[PDB]
Structures are given as C-alpha cells and as structure tokens.
Design a protein around this motif. Sequence first.
Motif, PDB file in Angstrom:
ATOM      1  N   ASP C  41       0.488  -1.251   0.121  1.00 44.26           N
ATOM      2  CA  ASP C  41       0.199  -0.174   0.260  1.00 44.26           C
ATOM      3  C   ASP C  41       1.020   1.393   0.154  1.00 44.26           C
ATOM      4  O   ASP C  41       2.096   1.025   0.231  1.00 44.26           O
ATOM      5  N   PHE C  42       0.402   2.292  -0.836  1.00 39.62           N
ATOM      6  CA  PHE C  42       0.761   3.665  -0.308  1.00 39.62           C
ATOM      7  C   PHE C  42       2.270   3.275  -1.547  1.00 39.62           C
ATOM      8  O   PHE C  42       3.782   4.775  -0.942  1.00 39.62           O
ATOM      9  N   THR C  43       2.779   2.799  -2.278  1.00 36.99           N
ATOM     10  CA  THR C  43       3.950   2.642  -3.118  1.00 36.99           C
ATOM     11  C   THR C  43       3.678   3.807  -3.647  1.00 36.99           C
ATOM     12  O   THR C  43       2.568   4.697  -4.176  1.00 36.99           O
ATOM     13  N   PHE C  44       5.281   4.336  -4.904  1.00 38.30           N
ATOM     14  CA  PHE C  44       5.039   5.702  -5.553  1.00 38.30           C
ATOM     15  C   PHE C  44       4.413   5.046  -7.027  1.00 38.30           C
ATOM     16  O   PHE C  44       4.233   5.623  -7.807  1.00 38.30           O
ATOM     17  N   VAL C  45       4.305   3.893  -7.270  1.00 39.85           N
ATOM     18  CA  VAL C  45       3.867   3.056  -8.451  1.00 39.85           C
ATOM     19  C   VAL C  45       2.095   3.501  -8.611  1.00 39.85           C
ATOM     20  O   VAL C  45       1.904   3.969  -7.601  1.00 39.85           O
ATOM     21  N   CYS C  46       1.449   3.749  -9.847  1.00 40.55           N
ATOM     22  CA  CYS C  46       0.428   3.750 -10.512  1.00 40.55           C
ATOM     23  C   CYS C  46       0.149   2.747  -9.640  1.00 40.55           C
ATOM     24  O   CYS C  46      -0.405   1.943  -9.935  1.00 40.55           O
ATOM     25  N   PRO C  47      -1.231   3.595  -8.937  1.00 43.05           N
ATOM     26  CA  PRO C  47      -2.926   2.938  -8.711  1.00 43.05           C
ATOM     27  C   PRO C  47      -2.903   2.258  -9.551  1.00 43.05           C
ATOM     28  O   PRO C  47      -4.315   1.363 -10.032  1.00 43.05           O
TER      29      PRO C  47
END
Lengths: 165, 167, 163, 166, 167, 165, 165, 165, 166, 163
Positions: C41-47
Amino acid sequence: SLINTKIKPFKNQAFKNGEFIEVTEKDTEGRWSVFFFYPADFTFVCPTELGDVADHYEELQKLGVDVYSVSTDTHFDHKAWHSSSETIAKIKYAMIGDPTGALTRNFDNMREDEGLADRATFVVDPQGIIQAIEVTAEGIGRDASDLLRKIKAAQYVAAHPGEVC
Amino acid sequence: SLINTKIKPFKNQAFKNGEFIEVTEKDTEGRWSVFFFYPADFTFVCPTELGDVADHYEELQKLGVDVYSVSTDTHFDHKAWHSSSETIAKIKYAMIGDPTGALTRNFDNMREDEGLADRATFVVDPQGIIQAIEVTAEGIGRDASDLLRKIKAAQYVAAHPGEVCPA
Amino acid sequence: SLINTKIKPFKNQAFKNGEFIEVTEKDTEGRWSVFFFYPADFTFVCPTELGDVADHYEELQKLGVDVYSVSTDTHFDHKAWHSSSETIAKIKYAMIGDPTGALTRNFDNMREDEGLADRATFVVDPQGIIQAIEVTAEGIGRDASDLLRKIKAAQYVAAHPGE
Amino acid sequence: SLINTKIKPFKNQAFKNGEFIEVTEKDTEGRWSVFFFYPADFTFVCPTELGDVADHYEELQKLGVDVYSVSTDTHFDHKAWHSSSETIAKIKYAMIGDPTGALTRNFDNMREDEGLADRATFVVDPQGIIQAIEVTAEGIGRDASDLLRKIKAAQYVAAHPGEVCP
Amino acid sequence: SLINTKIKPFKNQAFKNGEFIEVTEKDTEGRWSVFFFYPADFTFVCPTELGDVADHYEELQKLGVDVYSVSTDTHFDHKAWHSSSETIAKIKYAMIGDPTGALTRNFDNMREDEGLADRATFVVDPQGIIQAIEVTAEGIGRDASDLLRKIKAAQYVAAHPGEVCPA
Amino acid sequence: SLINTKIKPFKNQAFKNGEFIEVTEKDTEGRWSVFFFYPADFTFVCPTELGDVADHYEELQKLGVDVYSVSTDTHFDHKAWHSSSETIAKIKYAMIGDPTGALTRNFDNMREDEGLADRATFVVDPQGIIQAIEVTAEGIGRDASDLLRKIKAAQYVAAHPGEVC
Amino acid sequence: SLINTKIKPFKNQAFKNGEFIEVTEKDTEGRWSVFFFYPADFTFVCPTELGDVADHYEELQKLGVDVYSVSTDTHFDHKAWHSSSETIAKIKYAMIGDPTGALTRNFDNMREDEGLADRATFVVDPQGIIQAIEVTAEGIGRDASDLLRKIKAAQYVAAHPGEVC
Amino acid sequence: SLINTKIKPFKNQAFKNGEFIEVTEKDTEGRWSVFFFYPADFTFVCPTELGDVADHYEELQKLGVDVYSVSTDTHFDHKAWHSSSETIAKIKYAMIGDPTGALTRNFDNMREDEGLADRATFVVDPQGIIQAIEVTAEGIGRDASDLLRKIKAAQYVAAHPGEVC
Amino acid sequence: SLINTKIKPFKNQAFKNGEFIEVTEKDTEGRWSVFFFYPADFTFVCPTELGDVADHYEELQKLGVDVYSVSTDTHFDHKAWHSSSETIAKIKYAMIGDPTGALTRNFDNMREDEGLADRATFVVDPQGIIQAIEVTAEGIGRDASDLLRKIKAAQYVAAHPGEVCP
Amino acid sequence: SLINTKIKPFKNQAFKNGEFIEVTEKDTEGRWSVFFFYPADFTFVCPTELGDVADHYEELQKLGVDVYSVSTDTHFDHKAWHSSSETIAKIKYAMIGDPTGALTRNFDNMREDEGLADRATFVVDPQGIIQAIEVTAEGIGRDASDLLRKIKAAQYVAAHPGE
C-alpha cells in the motif's frame, strides 16, 4: 531472556524525516540504541507512546541515544502515517519497516498468529548488549520518562562499574 | 516474549512472616500478582528493589495485588535473610525459594551460567495472563511507582475495554 | 503448479466499503472469486491496476464474481490508503490484509526476502478451483479488460463442457 | 512462483521452418524469449492460440523476441502437424518437442495425470529472468495481443528503471 | 560409580575465613581433598556432619588433606550462615557455593527434583583420582572418624603398593 | 546417584551354606538388604572385608538384614572359594554369582574394561530404596562396624521419621 | 525380467481404426494380448515393424489374439499418422497413446533419456502373464513370423502343460 | 530394459570342450558376443535350445561371434552334462557356470524364487552394448535361425549407421 | 553361534533313491537330523566324506536319525551325479538341492564369494535344536565315525538330563 | 560365519604352568593356534575335554601348535582350579581368563543370557585364519584325537595346496 545478549544483524528500510534510509546493526555500533516495537500503524488508538518518545528525542539524542521504532508495516506505510497524524508527524527518529518479521523475530517479539510485533522496548548499549527490556499488553502504556531514567542509569553503570552499595 | 501467555503450574516453598508455606499457581487464580525476581539473598547490593516494593505493599494490597519475590535460594535462606536485615525485615509478602530453577525458567528468566535469576518483574492478571514484563541488567533498577501505574492501567483496561484515546 | 487445484482455507480481516469484516474460504464457496495480490500500500507506483479492476466491478458483480485484493499490509493500512488516494477510493470490493502472509503463501505468491506478495491474479470458480493465473514483475501491468474476458470465458466453459 | 527466477538449463529437439534443430538455454541468453506451452498436437482444439502468436511473430522478431512453442509431443509430431494444418503452417518460430517432460517440469507446468503441459505462457528476459507468467484452464484462451503489450512493457521497464508515477 | 575416575574441571566461588575466594581444580592438584556435599544452608537439621569435620580439620590438615564443603547455595549464603551459627562458625576450610549445580553434577550428586545436593563425601588424591565415595540418605550420618581411617589407608596404599594381607 | 532410588529386578544363582539357590528382587521385598560387591574370588588379597561382614552376620540377621555378596564370578567359583579359604568358609550369607554383569550394571558398578565389579556396598530398605552407598578403591577397606552403625541409623529413621534436631 | 509376471493395471486412450477408445487391463482379461512398443510416430524409419504385424492381424485375431501398438505419443498423434501413411492405414488394431509413460514403465520399457519406449514386443496370456519378451535396438528388426510361432507354441503349452522330453 | 546399455564386468569359471577356463568381460571386448541363458543342467527338457545354437556355431564363429551358455550350475556340472548327453557334447563354445548368480543378475535374468536364470538370449557388440534381448517361458522356444538374422542385421547397422527410409 | 538355536523353516527339492521329493522342516520335526553340507557336485574332491556317511546310514536309520546332504546344486545335478559315481550311488538318504542358497544361509554356511556352501555338518534334535556343529576348510575332512559318536552322545543326554560326573 | 576368516585382536590375562602372563593376537602370529572355549571352571561336569587335550599337548607342541583354553572366569579362578583338580593340574598350556567376554565375543561364542562361552574349539593357522570349527551342546564331548587329526590335515593342506 534476551537480557544481556548481543543484538543480531539486520537490514531494514526506514522512513526518517521525509527520507527513506537503510538501517543495519552497523548503524548501531558504538551508540546507545532504543528499539521501540509496536503492533501496527494507522490503528484507532492514538500513538501517544510513539509521541512521548518523540517529545524526549532531543534529550535522548543529547545522551547519544538513537531511537528506532518498529512495526511489521512497510516504510511506505510509515511515510503515509507520518504525514496524516499530528502525533506521528512529531517523529524525527527512524521508523523501521519490518515486513519480513526478521527484526521482530531477532528480538523474539512476534505474535505469530497476527504477523504483528508485541509492545516491547529494548535498550541496547554501544557493544550491542541488551540492558533493559520492557513489554506490555495493549492499554498499559510505556512511560517515556521511565525509559529516560533507565537509559541514564544504564549509562552511569557503564561508566562507574561496580555500583558499590 | 512471554507477554500475553498464561503462567505455568508451579509448586515452591516460601517464607512469609515467620512461616514456611507452599505456593502454587492455584494461589494466584482470581488475583492480580506481581512476581519479583532477584539474583541472590545476602548480597551486598542495595536491597533497594526489594524494600521499595515492600513499602508500596500497602497500596498493592488495597488493589487486590499479591506479591511474590523469587530467587534460586531456598526458603531457609530467605528466613535467615529476613531476620538479619532491617530492609528485608519489612517484607510481609511471600518470599519464594526456587532451588530447582523451575519457576525461574517458567518465566524464561534464568541466567544459565550463574544459576541465578535475572532482575525481572512480571504482572499477572486473575486469569493467569502475563500483562507486563520488565527485565533490567544490574544497576539499572526497577521503579515500584511505574509498576503501580502499570498495574492500575492493567486493572482499568480489564474493567473498561476500549476506552483509549481515539486517533 | 496451482492451476486446476482447490484453494486452501484462510481467515483474514479486510476493509470493505467503509467497514472491517472477516473473510474466509467459506465466503467463496458457491461463487466466482478473483484474488488480486499486489506488493504494498502507499507506494509511488501508479495505483492503476487496482483502480481499473474497480471500474469493471459493477459488471463483475453482475456476473456473480467477487473481488478480493490482497497485500501483506493490515486492513488498517488499507483503510488509510483508501481514504487518501482517489484511485483507491473507487474500490468497493474487499481489501484483504495479510500480515501473517498465510493467504499469500497459500497461493505460493510470497517474495520471501521482502515479505510482500508478488503481482498475481487468480480466478477461482464456485468449487474453489483455480481456472486462471497471471503473474507479472513490477512495471508490467495487468489488464482488467483481459481479466474480464478470461472470466466470461471461464464461465462459458463451466456451462458448456467441451466445444 | 517462478516469477523473477532464472530459467533452467535445457536441451530439446525442435521443428523450425522445415528443418530439425536443437534448442538449449544458450540460444535464449541475451535475447527476449516467449515460451508458449500447450497440451497436444493434432487436437480438435482451435489452433487459434498458436496461429495468433504467428500473426504477431514478425513484429515480435522486430523487437528482439524469439518464440518457442512447447508440447510433450516429439519434434516429428510437430513437422507432421505443421504440414497438415494451415494454421500451424503459418508458424515460423521454433516448435520444441518435450517428450521427457523435462522442459515443461522446469517451468512447473506438467499436468502429471495426463503427461501433457498446461496452457501457459512465460516471458523471459535477456538475463534468463521470468518477467511474466500466464496459465489458463482448457478453453479459456490466451490473448496474443495482451502478450505483446506485456512484452513491450517489460522491454520498456528494462530500459527505464524506477519509473515513478507522474 | 565415579570411583577411580579423575575429577572434572570446575570454577566456583567460596567463603573461607571471612573472605570470598575462587576455587578450581588447579587448587586440588598435588593435594589430597575431601569434598563434603550437603543439601542446604540454614537448615534446622543437626549441622552435626559439618561440625564434626570441622573438629577433625586439624588432623586432616596434618595429613596434607584440604577440605571443601559444597551445597547449591551461594557463597553469600555461606558467609551469612558462618556468622550466625556457632557450629558453622568453627569452619575454617572453604565453603563452596554451587548455584549452577555444575560441581554437584560433576560428582553425579544432584537431587534433580530438589535442586539440592545429596549427603555425599568424596576423597580425591593428588592426581585428581576419586579413591573413596560415601552417599547417605537424610538421618543416617557420615562418620568423620571412619573418613580419617579411609584417608590414612588411601595414603598408606599410595606409598606402599602391595602390602595387603596375603591369602 | 542411585541414592534414594529403587533397586531393579534381577535373577541370579548363589551359593549359600553348601547349597545353590536362586535369588531375585522378590527375595528382598519386605526386608533390609546389603549388596556387597567385590571384584574377584581367589585373588591374592585376604577377604577380610567379606569376613568382617560374616563376623557381624548373626547380629545383622537379628536386625532383619539379609546380606548378599556379589562378584562377576560364578556360583561354582564361589562354592570352590568357600571350601578353600578359611575366611570365606565363615560365610553364611548368600554369595551371588553375576557372570552376565546384569546385577552389577543394575547398580552401575561395573569396571567395563575389566568385567569386574567395583568395591561398592549398598544398603536397601524394605521398600527397595537405596539408603546408603559406599565405594572404595583397592586397599581402602570397608569397615563392617560402620556398616552396622549406618544400617541401625537407617532403621531408626524409618521408625522415627523427622529426626528433629 | 518381467517374464512370467502379471501385467499391471493401466488405463490409456487409443485409436482403433476411425474412433477413440479407452483400453484397460480388463480389455485383456481372458484373452491373448500382444503389446508392440515403438519409439515415435511420424519417424523417418520405415513402419515395416508396425505394418508387418498388421498383415498377420487376420491370422492373429483367429487365434484369439489382440494387438496393441504403443508409443509415448498421444492417440491424437496416432489418428493423424494413420491417415498420412499407407503403411499405417493398414492397422486395424488399437494404437495406444502413452504420454504419461506409465504403460511403458509398467513394462520397464522406457528410454528415460528420450521419453520414448524401446522397440519391444510382449506376449500376454489370458491370465495376464507375460510369456515372451523381445527388445531390439533401432535397426535390428522384429520378425512378424517368429512372433506368430511364439504365440502358437505359447498356446500349445497352454492346453498341454509341460510336455516332457 | 538393459537394451542399449553396456554389460557389466564379470569373472566366471567355464567349461569349453574338454578344459576349464575363466571368462571375463575382457574376453568379449572387441568381439560380438551372444549370452545364452537356461535354467538348469540335467533337466528333463530337450536341450534343443542349446544344441540348435551349436549347429549354427560354425557360421557364427565366421561372423566373428562368440557364444557363452550360462546357468547357475557350476562348470563342474557342465563338464559332466557335456559327457552324458549327445545333444550337449555338440557344444564347442564356453559353458559358463554362475553359482553366485552375479552374471545372471548383471543381466537382470534371475528367477529369484528358484535361483535359476530365465530362458533369455542377449547380443552384445564389440563395444559391450546389448543390441537384442529375448526372454521366453519354459515351452516357447528360442529360434536359432532368428538369432542369426538378428546378428546379421545388427552387424549391418554396425558399419552402415542408420539407413533412413 | 547357531548352537542351541532352532532351525528355520525351509522348502527344497531333493533326490532320494531314484525319485524327486520335497523336503521341508516339517519332515525333521520329531526326528534326529544331520544336515551335511558340501561345496559342489561332480568335483575331483574324493567323495569320501559323503560315501562314509552312507557307510553309517543303516546304523543311523536304526537310531532314528535322518540324513540330508546339501549343496547349492540342483536336485537334477544330484540325480546325475548319483548315477555316474559309485561312491555317490551308495547314498540312500535325501540329497537336497539349494540353488537359492536359502537353506545354506539359514545355517549361515554360504561362501558368499563362490555361491557354494562350506563344509559343515549340523546335528539337529527332535525339537529342531542344533546340538552339534562342525565346519572345516577345504581338504581337512569330517569323520563320519566321530559324527556317530556325537549323535549317540546327544541322544543319550536327551534321555538322561543332568548327568553329573561320578 | 567364521570359517576362513582372520581372528580379531585381543588382550587377556592367563595362567600358564604356574605363572600369570598376558596373551594377545600378536602371540599367535606365525603359529598354529587352538582356542578351546568351555563354560565355567569348577562345575560338576567331567573335566575330561580339557584333560584330554593336555594328554596330546606334547605332540601338539612338537607340531608347533599352541593351545589356549578359554572361559569367562578370571585367571585367578583358573589358577585355583588348576591346583584343586587332578585333571586340570595336567594342563601345561595357557588358561585364558575372559571376564570382559571380548575374546569370546570375537569368536561369536557367547551364551548372552548366561555370560559363559559355548563349548567351541577353533583351529587357527599362522596367518590367523580359522581353518576348523567345532561347537557342541553340553554332554556331547569334543574328541582330542579328532582335533589332532584335523590339525595334521590342516598342516598338510597348507604345505601341499590342492590334491
């Protein structure tokens, strides 16, 4: 117990003041350290314990004591909690993410059926030896002042071996 | 750690107010208990940790909390220590003798290369659940006040589940 | 391999449209299930992978298909992420928390040195049989439309054996 | 998973454009590879899955992507099937035969009760690392076009590491 | 039994004439030793076995025989016992403390369910060889005279091998 | 140690007053027993220890104490030694032959590299519990008088539990 | 050797002139069966071993003998070969496909290195007992005639038990 | 199957018309060898299997082929049989005795229940590779002729590697 | 040793006075038995050992003693040897064949390097208990007369237990 | 089986013609040895087996053969028996004591439930190879004359291989 034993090697990602850093046992060598474990970020209980410690951080850093809070959440979860909670916002020490559970298991502090660490605090000296351990169930808070007192008493004993009584 | 687990059965002899009694886990059921472990009787060290707990023994008793100190010495050694030191003389709670080290090991609190228990305090609730654990190296000291605060917090939390600050 | 095998029992907490619920294998019995695992959760990759499945959600519910996204984060982390990201806020299906990693290990989908699940999607039928599997390394996205296609096809096959 | 693991050494006979050759992991090194497994040669099954990969082969070759189809049949069976079927005949890539089951087991894709490989597709990069996996039950269908998109995406990522979200 | 085997290395703390010393096997080399084990300090039991050996400590010393009493209590407990009982006050030989039970176990003399050593006396020669062993249940008593006779016989036999009655 | 443990079952042949008899632990039940081990018959050392005991046999039998001497020699060897040595001739108690070494090993008293038993004496009460153990190297004799004293003290303690002191 | 042992259970899909069937050990019970193994379909080797058996098929069926050819290829592969080779189209017996290799291994006839059965022929009586075995390397052929002589003699001993010389 | 594998080392005593010799794998190196196994000497079964091989012995020796008959009986038993049976006296090749059963087991040809080899024939090339195997139950005979055809064809492939069709 | 142990079950084919029979431990029960093992049939070896037992067979039979000779040869080999040798022909007792080696191994008497039994003789009583054992190296020689004395002695002891020394 | 196997190393005390000596396998190297085991010293059974070997002793020494009788009794018991029995007093060869039972177990000749050796005789050649074995139950005696015969024969064979 783990009292009087040497901490084990570890390598974890952490969130510290807007930055993501890597922490290992190398970073603890020659320093006094506090490993502060807690179960989970973003729960519904206010993080007063983590906040109490942040309140004494400056004084702890003066004492040469580094602080590492730890949960099995990621450093990404930590970054998000830091920017969304006023209390966690006050945190200047490193917030270690331990999703593999290895740091938590090194300290024998894992609730295996939950995948979450227990509420334990460990005081480690410059040679890596655990000098104080505190563990409490939910609801029983850990007093940052008492933590300060112990660290000071531990630092004294190290400088004045043989506390003649 | 042992946090949140149930204490294991035990049967030890103890010295309590001029008497030798037997203590087992049945004695702790339905009560709040503090198990106070120390390394050795007759030690030159400030019997400061044992005396302070004896001082707050009044309050503790008001709160329904029983106290048991434990070391690998025998009850016979405890009796003798009790009547030779004024500080130890204040103790009115049971002094458990653990020569086989089984009680000390149940609480995973044995210094194996010394045959002596580490300085550790355990808070156990009426159902036998360990709610708080404190272990310190020599010279650090356990604050009996912080202990009292913990016990009251444990009792409060048992009576009023869920009343902690909302995030 | 897991293809054509039955899912294992599991019990996990989840965040679903504002509430915390418990999800177990018994909740999948008699239904079509999609287990959508992701790393964190909350990573910089596009959700984008999660949000796109959400776009096709109503249609999946129409086909009697339940969707469960899974990460080794807690249901608390999921709730927080859902209210802080616009793409995640679109999610109306169950977001399962798997901090013990058991649900992830059931699907042999754990990166053991990271403690995070790999990007894998599993299509499970009413009898608990895995009919489709898709796993991709980071940066390679999973297409929700293709998932929809495979699900409709899986359903046809079930209703029209051999052809 | 096999995801992010390196493929294992292998040595099989294959049918490719009229000739019999031998393929080993050496051929895949330094190249992008697609291992497309299927159950059996000469089956009623609409050979649409293999023929569709053929349809994208030219573009795949242009991107540096080799393709290998694999079934537990012999390379002999592949030659025959290639000359009797118009769909199969469109295939210009290697058709690996895996009668020992070794290659298929390396990719953990054997239906042990049938002696046939499951319908799975694997994308392998120049360093031998599996970057994409897809397995489907009989009759579900793999989309050659989605495979193409995945490959381009993987190639893109290998060139632009850590592509954060704008 | 341990008869005729060499004692194992050990390192224990002891109380000897108002002092705390460390004792190890090196201390026994080249000397005759008597290791006197008893269950517990401060016990209501007739400290009769410990006092009688203290009485014959004069002769023993004439014969070059060192004495060490041992229990699982600590040296601290020994010091306290020494200055609280007149009978124990007579002891001028080392009182070894064996809280880890390693010394007691080396001599296979531990009551495992009590964590206390059994009533046992061992005679060890200058090369570390155990020449005589005596173990008794509570209440039976070890005769310090018969001990002296054994030691002298052991010394005689070491000096004059083969001078025993001919059949 | 074997102190305070119960003897183990055994079945051996013995030579007793001109007769060959079979002895088992059944024969010891309800009685006080002395198991007197020695290395070997017919050696060149006079059997004074076995003779001392024979001298006190009558008094021991009065005390309800049975005596069994033991070596790994056979009962045949014992019969022959009895009729060829004046000292052994005085023996009226049972002389157990233990060629299998089982009785000796039951008491953990075997010198394994010699196949001979060590010089050990065991006092066993009516319930089969060992109350006294004495072991000596060659040349250091076992005093039958001291053995009498111990057996009497042991019998006292059994009748007056809690020897208040 | 598997000579004189009883065949093992098996279930395989097969192609018998035109259609697909399933063969089991049951299909052999109370019947003389011949299992003919070969390495692979569509091979550059002249199917003289398979087609020559076909020729004697009429005579064989008369003796009450069934024929099963076997290769690790599937039955699908078999149907295809039976329609692209005159030599193969001559086959009227069941062409068993054995992709799992269990049938081949039941007869210990697998080239583990190639995943193809060896060139072997077996004769099984009505009770399921193998009465004749023949294995040859690629090149050396298997005689159709001889096979027949074997079966004939094999059947003689069937009704006329051991005819001493 | 042992088809296409290399024979294993062996050393056996044998009877070759008149004298006793020792055969080893070395005797076969660089030579075509035929191992003919049979159950037992002096049996009521007509030695037609052994004597018929003898007949083709001249032609065989010409092709550069050696013959070794083998049974679990000793070579002593062989010499005796070779002098009491006309059919056997016809034998000019080596009659190997295999009482330990190692030769038979090397070829996996033992009836473990009887301790007698089965009726099997093997063809080994100069490199020690088995090119043809044949096993039959007592009754079904082994064709002398066929054996020859096999060897002839086997040798063709020898010089003319795989002759595609 | 095997001394004082009970023989083990067995089932072998044997040649006895022209006919082929089957011997099992059942036949030895309730009887005195002598198992006379030897290396091999048709050997240069002076068959003097077997022929000598034959010479005492009549008396042995009169005492209730059966005799069985054993070699790892077949019973077929025994028939042949019995008709071609005048010494062997004097044999009226059973000649057991032990090609599986089982009987010989039961008596722990196999020369494992040769597949032949060692030269050993065993006396077995009615209850199956081995009362006498004798094993000798090649060329040493067993004395049939000493065997006879041993048997009489064993029979005597079975009848008069605990015969002390006068 | 032990026939044609090499004896194992051993070290035991013995009584020999008035003296106590130590005997080991090294004492048998290069000599012909007879190991004569028996149950026990001083039993009521006729000492005839031992005394008869003694009668043939001088002849055995003439052939270069050593004799060692063995029982699990000690060399002390043997000395005593030798001076109390007339049949045993004739013994001039070594009487080995085997209280540890090792020499007896080397020859696999122990009655484990009695701790006594069985009645067995072994003929050992200069190279330590057992050429003859004879074991009998109690009451069945061993004949010294037959032993002598086997020994002479063993010697012939050694000096004239094959015949």
